[PDB]
Design a protein around this ligand. Structure first.
Ligand SMILES: C[C@H](CC(=O)O)S(=O)(=O)c1ccc(Cl)cc1
Ligand SMILES: C[C@H](CC(=O)O)S(=O)(=O)c1ccc(Cl)cc1
Lengths: 237, 300
């Protein structure tokens, strides 16, 4: 089914699973036209498909050419997401195929179920968790690869860098969702927190800086403080 | 005309014959129904006065044999049988008619209601949904499940309706996922009409039979099937114009005949709003929309 805190390890049972976020598939800018009407212009987007246990991210880049001459684009985007996820599963060896696919938005259930009819043993499910994966585009190396693409393209990342050498995936996913929630709430301040100290750098083959254990505790504190700060600014608390 | 005599009526029971019904009292001198119009199927149905459990009954066609009813005190119900001795049957009936122990099927001559509910329903197609080959008539009751219901459990006693499932490989061509899921025309026209039913008349017959089983027996499996076959048409962008026109007539007479006091359970609010107001055929069911809005506006 749909998931909860009433199992804080059922989403984390032992099966290969993937989280599929479609927020950033169809992206537009809205602008006035010479005649004073309004028009959209699409820009490149991406499907965020993530394994919680391993950190492997299958970033499918959605080139704007996909939309050319098509109608009802918000609806098509859900069906294109489902098609690309289904094609990813079929490309993986059987022993790497997922036992569960978990969509961050309920509107993806029917399109992904219909595309995956040939895989009756793969459960397609929603989640009550509010995951901040829409902020994936605030990660500079992912935004850069999406906006430079000139053609459809799939790019593989480990979104936890080398963290699993030192922490559990439960803790790594915790760190990731706190980082993305902060970037979603106040992008500039979150980035200021992550980069301020220039003696800590981002390895060329990483997405995040090379913090020691003690520095990550500090950085995590500053992210919790930013989120609280913004909650205060928002509600006048 | 034709006749369904009864040996006796030893238990009190409400007897239905098509859309008509009447009460018989315990051991009252009732010996059946006469003047039944030849040329249509019919259904004779029962609900025991002392145990409303199990509505049950019999679909039959007086052209296919001579049928009578007799109570079985072991199985506790009114059973249909076929009398093969014709001269005997005629002798029995004439005696009951001479002694006026039979009720007359009460057909008004302005009334086409039963023709309008059974236009496409054919006894040969009923007997393939209800499998009991050694009889010329078919038994149905409140509790019989459908083949589809027994997939989600004695298969000999099931209703073998054609299974309709919008999220199945049969409804969805590989490579046309979005297209076939948002527009059911492939499933309706190629899979169901050309493939399984062969023509629209057989599809509407199964539809009409599903509605009548649901309304006369309170069969949940039938109610599901009726709504599914309606939704399959309405959810298709490409339907022959003759089919849409005929569907509007079919549904109009079903809504007109539905007892108002059973509307809450016999009409699925979700399905009807979709069909009348959201679907591809939202504008193609003018007579049905009007009666639904004037008679059951609460459901909408
Ligand atoms: C911010 C918290 C974590 C932290 O403050 O270190 S949380 O809201 O992301 C959280 C929420 C759900 C789960 Cl399953 C785990 C962590
Ligand atoms: C649906 C409920 C019964 C059930 O779920 O079996 S009910 O009682 O309202 C119902 C019963 C019979 C029919 Cl023909 C339609 C609905």
């Amino acid at each position: 089914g749909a998931m909860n805190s009433s199992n804080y390890a059922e989403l984390f049972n032992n099966d290969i699973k993937l989280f599929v976020d479609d927020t950033n598939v169809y992206r537009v800018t809205v602008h006035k036209t010479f005649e004073g009407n309004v028009a959209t212009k699409a820009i490149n987007g991406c499907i965020f498909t993530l394994n919680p246990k391993t950190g492997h991210l299958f970033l499918k880049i959605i080139h704007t050419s996909v939309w050319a001459g098509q109608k009802r684009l918000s609806q098509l985007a859900k069906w294109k997401t489902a098609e690309e996820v289904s094609a990813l599963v079929r490309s993986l060896p059987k022993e790497e195929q997922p036992k569960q696919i978990i969509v961050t938005r309920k509107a993806m259930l029917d399109p992904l179920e219909v595309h995956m009819l040939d895989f009756p043993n793969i459960a397609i499910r929603p989640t009550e968790l509010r995951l901040p994966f829409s902020a994936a585009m605030s990660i500079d190396k992912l935004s850069d690869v999406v906006m430079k693409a000139t053609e459809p393209q799939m790019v593989l990342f480990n979104i936890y860098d080398d963290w699993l050498d030192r922490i559990s995936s439960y803790t790594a996913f915790s760190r990731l969702t706190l980082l993305l929630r902060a970037l979603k709430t106040n992008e500039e301040s979150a980035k200021m927190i992550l980069l301020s100290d220039p003696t800590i750098t981002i390895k060329s083959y990483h997405l995040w800086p090379s913090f020691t254990d003690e520095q990550w505790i500090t950085i995590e504190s500053q992210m919790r403080d930013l989120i609280l700060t913004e909650y205060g600014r928002k509600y006048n608390v | 005309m034709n006749t369904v005599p009864f040996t006796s009526a030893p238990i009190e029971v409400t007897i239905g014959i098509d859309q008509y019904s009447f009460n018989v009292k315990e051991n009252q001198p009732f010996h059946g129904i006469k003047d039944i119009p030849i040329g249509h199927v019919h259904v004779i149905h029962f609900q025991h006065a002392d145990n409303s459990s199990m509505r049950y009954g019999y679909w039959f066609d007086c052209r296919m044999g001579n049928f009578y009813i007799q109570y079985d005190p072991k199985d506790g119900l009114y059973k249909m049988m076929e009398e093969r001795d014709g001269a005997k049957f005629e002798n029995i009936v004439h005696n009951f008619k001479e002694r006026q122990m039979m009720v007359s099927y009460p057909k008004i001559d302005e009334d086409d209601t039963w023709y309008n509910l059974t236009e496409f329903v054919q006894m040969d197609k009923i007997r393939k949904i209800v499998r009991k080959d050694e009889n010329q008539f078919s038994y149905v009751d409140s509790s019989m499940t459908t083949v589809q219901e027994n997939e989600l459990s004695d298969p000999a006693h099931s209703l073998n309706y054609t299974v309709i499932n919008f999220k199945s490989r049969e409804a969805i061509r590989p490579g046309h996922e979005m297209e076939d899921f948002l527009d059911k025309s492939y499933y309706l026209n190629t899979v169901m009409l050309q493939g399984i039913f062969k023509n629209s008349s057989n599809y509407f017959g199964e539809l009409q039979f599903a509605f009548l089983n649901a309304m006369f027996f309170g069969n949940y499996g039938s109610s599901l099937q009726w709504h599914a076959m309606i939704e399959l048409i309405c959810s298709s962008a490409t339907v022959p114009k003759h089919m849409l026109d005929k569907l509007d007539e079919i549904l109009y007479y079903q809504i007109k005949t539905l007892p108002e006091q059973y509307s809450d359970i016999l009409l699925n609010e979700r399905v009807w709003n979709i069909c009348l107001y959201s679907s591809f055929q939202k504008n193609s069911l003018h007579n049905t929309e009007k009666i639904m809005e004037n008679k059951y506006p609460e459901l909408l």
